Design an enzyme around this catalytic site. Sequence first.
Site, mmCIF file in Angstrom:
data_model
loop_
_atom_site.group_PDB
_atom_site.id
_atom_site.type_symbol
_atom_site.label_atom_id
_atom_site.label_comp_id
_atom_site.label_asym_id
_atom_site.label_seq_id
_atom_site.Cartn_x
_atom_site.Cartn_y
_atom_site.Cartn_z
ATOM 1 N N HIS A 157 -28.228 63.534 129.534
ATOM 2 C CA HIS A 157 -28.628 62.279 128.905
ATOM 3 C C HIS A 157 -27.685 61.966 127.746
ATOM 4 O O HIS A 157 -27.972 62.282 126.595
ATOM 5 C CB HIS A 157 -30.075 62.349 128.408
ATOM 6 C CG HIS A 157 -31.060 62.506 129.502
ATOM 7 N ND1 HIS A 157 -31.239 61.537 130.470
ATOM 8 C CD2 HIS A 157 -31.913 63.507 129.805
ATOM 9 C CE1 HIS A 157 -32.162 61.961 131.313
ATOM 10 N NE2 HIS A 157 -32.593 63.140 130.927
ATOM 11 N N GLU A 199 -36.581 72.483 129.552
ATOM 12 C CA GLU A 199 -36.617 72.108 128.132
ATOM 13 C C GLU A 199 -37.221 73.161 127.212
ATOM 14 O O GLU A 199 -38.010 72.853 126.337
ATOM 15 C CB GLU A 199 -37.253 70.746 127.924
ATOM 16 C CG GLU A 199 -36.510 69.659 128.657
ATOM 17 C CD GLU A 199 -37.048 68.265 128.435
ATOM 18 O OE1 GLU A 199 -38.092 68.138 127.742
ATOM 19 O OE2 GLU A 199 -36.427 67.297 128.940
ATOM 20 N N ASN A 208 -33.402 74.099 133.497
ATOM 21 C CA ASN A 208 -32.917 72.748 133.236
ATOM 22 C C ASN A 208 -33.160 72.374 131.783
ATOM 23 O O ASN A 208 -34.232 72.668 131.224
ATOM 24 C CB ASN A 208 -33.705 71.805 134.146
ATOM 25 C CG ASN A 208 -33.132 70.419 134.272
ATOM 26 O OD1 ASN A 208 -31.947 70.242 134.606
ATOM 27 N ND2 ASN A 208 -33.958 69.406 134.041
ATOM 28 N N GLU A 230 -29.891 64.788 135.538
ATOM 29 C CA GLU A 230 -30.610 63.582 135.084
ATOM 30 C C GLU A 230 -29.651 62.625 134.389
ATOM 31 O O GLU A 230 -30.009 62.029 133.383
ATOM 32 C CB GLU A 230 -31.795 63.915 134.184
ATOM 33 C CG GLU A 230 -32.722 64.972 134.717
ATOM 34 C CD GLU A 230 -33.929 65.202 133.866
ATOM 35 O OE1 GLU A 230 -34.215 64.470 132.916
ATOM 36 O OE2 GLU A 230 -34.655 66.228 134.204
HETATM 37 O O1 LIG Z 1 -28.502 67.014 116.637
HETATM 38 C C1 LIG Z 1 -28.944 65.869 117.134
HETATM 39 N N1 LIG Z 1 -28.880 64.719 116.460
HETATM 40 C C2 LIG Z 1 -29.227 63.403 116.968
HETATM 41 C C3 LIG Z 1 -29.463 63.397 118.467
HETATM 42 C C4 LIG Z 1 -30.328 64.572 118.893
HETATM 43 O O2 LIG Z 1 -30.540 64.575 120.303
HETATM 44 C C5 LIG Z 1 -31.588 63.814 120.808
HETATM 45 O O3 LIG Z 1 -32.655 64.643 121.000
HETATM 46 C C6 LIG Z 1 -33.785 63.932 121.527
HETATM 47 C C7 LIG Z 1 -33.472 63.372 122.917
HETATM 48 O O4 LIG Z 1 -34.562 62.599 123.387
HETATM 49 C C8 LIG Z 1 -32.204 62.529 122.851
HETATM 50 O O5 LIG Z 1 -31.833 62.108 124.184
HETATM 51 C C9 LIG Z 1 -31.087 63.255 122.113
HETATM 52 O O6 LIG Z 1 -29.986 62.347 121.958
HETATM 53 C C10 LIG Z 1 -29.561 65.864 118.559
HETATM 54 O O7 LIG Z 1 -30.356 67.029 118.743
HETATM 55 O O1 LIG Z 2 -36.726 66.402 132.535
HETATM 56 C C1 LIG Z 2 -36.898 65.276 132.047
HETATM 57 N N1 LIG Z 2 -36.529 64.959 130.822
HETATM 58 C C2 LIG Z 2 -36.529 63.620 130.207
HETATM 59 C C3 LIG Z 2 -36.804 62.554 131.249
HETATM 60 C C4 LIG Z 2 -37.981 63.009 132.070
HETATM 61 O O2 LIG Z 2 -38.455 62.010 132.984
HETATM 62 C C5 LIG Z 2 -39.256 61.038 132.371
HETATM 63 O O3 LIG Z 2 -40.460 61.650 131.996
HETATM 64 C C6 LIG Z 2 -41.306 60.725 131.311
HETATM 65 C C7 LIG Z 2 -41.723 59.631 132.252
HETATM 66 O O4 LIG Z 2 -42.528 58.700 131.542
HETATM 67 C C8 LIG Z 2 -40.516 58.927 132.842
HETATM 68 O O5 LIG Z 2 -40.902 58.065 133.892
HETATM 69 C C9 LIG Z 2 -39.520 59.959 133.371
HETATM 70 O O6 LIG Z 2 -38.287 59.330 133.684
HETATM 71 C C10 LIG Z 2 -37.551 64.201 132.907
HETATM 72 O O7 LIG Z 2 -38.658 64.717 133.586
#
Ligand SMILES: O=C1NCC[C@@H](O[C@@H]2OC[C@@H](O)[C@H](O)[C@H]2O)[C@@H]1O
Ligand SMILES: O=C1NCC[C@@H](O[C@@H]2OC[C@@H](O)[C@H](O)[C@H]2O)[C@@H]1O
Length: 301
Positions: free
Chosen positions: A206, A127, A169, A235
């Site tokens: 996601h 990230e 990742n 994920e």
């Molecule tokens: O350009 C965007 N607009 C709205 C959605 C946003 O993406 C989110 O970023 C935070 C993550 O936790 C979410 O899973 C993701 O949908 C995006 O950058």
């Molecule tokens: O790489 C990741 N990105 C978003 C999901 C995250 O996993 C979560 O991390 C926060 C915890 O509270 C949750 O249990 C877990 O799923 C993951 O590491």
Amino acid sequence: ESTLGAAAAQSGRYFGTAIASGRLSDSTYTSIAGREFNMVTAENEMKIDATEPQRGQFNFSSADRVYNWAVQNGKQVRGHTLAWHSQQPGWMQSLSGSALRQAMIDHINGVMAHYKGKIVQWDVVNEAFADGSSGARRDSNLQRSGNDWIEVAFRTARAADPSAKLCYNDYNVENWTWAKTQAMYNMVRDFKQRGVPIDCVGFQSHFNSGSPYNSNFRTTLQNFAALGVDVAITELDIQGAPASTYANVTNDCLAVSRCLGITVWGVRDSDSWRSEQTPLLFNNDGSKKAAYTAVLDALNG
Ligand SMILES: O=C1NCC[C@@H](O[C@@H]2OC[C@@H](O)[C@H](O)[C@H]2O)[C@@H]1O
Ligand SMILES: O=C1NCC[C@@H](O[C@@H]2OC[C@@H](O)[C@H](O)[C@H]2O)[C@@H]1O
Ligand code: NA
Ligand code: NA
Ligand code: NA
Ligand code: NA
């Protein structure tokens, strides 16, 4: 084949899940996960706070519960994650600059030594890019230590365990037209040009209304693969768990020779970090959802 992992394996791929150590006493959970998946990621137990709760004092108890469960049940393990702005222990959050750099290196070295030769893929860095239009790096203590933090993490990891595949990742990096995707692409291309060790790119996947699946995910996977890295879906979860989208993602992986496999981010909807979005393949009672059948069918051709 009758199970996801076995079906994936017929094409040389895995089908994995995130496993939570605290749930390993849940008979429904362990039996379904044991049956269906051939790859495991620790959901939380291999993160920086869990593994190094005080500086220099490693705690692998929960991590090893997950690892050992995996191996006892015939699964490989993806290590998640060595360097990340989130879920840092407080002592690391307070560090900056060169002190943080040293601690980042030390953490990589200590965790990887514990698992040397035992973990097939590590999410070395997670990230690092900001969301939105800029393609900038995310603001964090790590990024403030220098643009080179990512490369240094990878070089550290390559030296610590030459057998591990080293993955970068991220999320919101699946849509080929998005600025974040292109920022990641530019970085990986730069790394390959300069000889920074990077073996794999992880697409968290996601998918939801704000970050929807696009058919161009196949293009993204192809284009990264062409840089000379493997790709993995790490994920996966999909808001509402539509069968169509789950099949589409599965078929995108199956179409790309260097797509190693798919991990979904949990077992039952109630196990999901985003349970309210009912985004996984099994119901709360452990029964198969429509998306399960769609994935299995796609894996089976
Ligand atoms: O350009 C965007 N607009 C709205 C959605 C946003 O993406 C989110 O970023 C935070 C993550 O936790 C979410 O899973 C993701 O949908 C995006 O950058
Ligand atoms: O790489 C990741 N990105 C978003 C999901 C995250 O996993 C979560 O991390 C926060 C915890 O509270 C949750 O249990 C877990 O799923 C993951 O590491
Ligand atoms: Na089978
Ligand atoms: Na079986
Ligand atoms: Na099926
Ligand atoms: Na079929």
